[PDB]
Amino acid sequence: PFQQFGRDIADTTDAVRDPQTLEILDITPCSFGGVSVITPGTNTSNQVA
Amino acid sequence: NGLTVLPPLLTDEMIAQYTSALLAGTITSGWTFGAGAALQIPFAMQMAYR
Ligand SMILES: *[C@@H]1O[C@H](CO)[C@@H](O)[C@H](O)[C@H]1NC(C)=O
């Protein structure tokens, strides 16, 4: 009843109580990752994925 | 938190096919699949060899 937010194993906040209702929301971080370019040799084609 | 984990190139299912292949070569053909094509030999005679 008194708890306002929750944490993952290593410090990071992973859930919050909405202060107006009582709902508990999980937080997922922004989607992110490496852009990687898959290519034949430029000697044979210029199409890439 | 800016950290990313990348998958292995070979899945656990693909590794389990290679460990089945090495095992099925070893059972049916002794060491011969390490020298060339697998040559079948009866398993009692492969142990008689070993
Ligand atoms: C806050 O107000 C809303 C209506 O706007 C109400 O539905 C909600 O139960 C209230 N929560 C409390 C008691 O803080």
UniProtKB/Swiss-Prot annotation, chain B:
Domain of life: Viruses
Job description of the protein: Subunit of the fusion protein that is processed upon entry into the host cell. Mediates fusion of the virion and cellular membranes by functioning as a class I viral fusion protein. Contains a viral fusion peptide that is unmasked after S2 cleavage. This cleavage can occur at the cell membrane by host TMPRSS2 or during endocytosis by host CSTL. In either case, this triggers an extensive and irreversible conformational change that leads to fusion of the viral envelope with the cellular cytoplasmic membrane, releasing viral genomic RNA into the host cell cytoplasm.
Protein name according to UniProt: Spike protein S2'
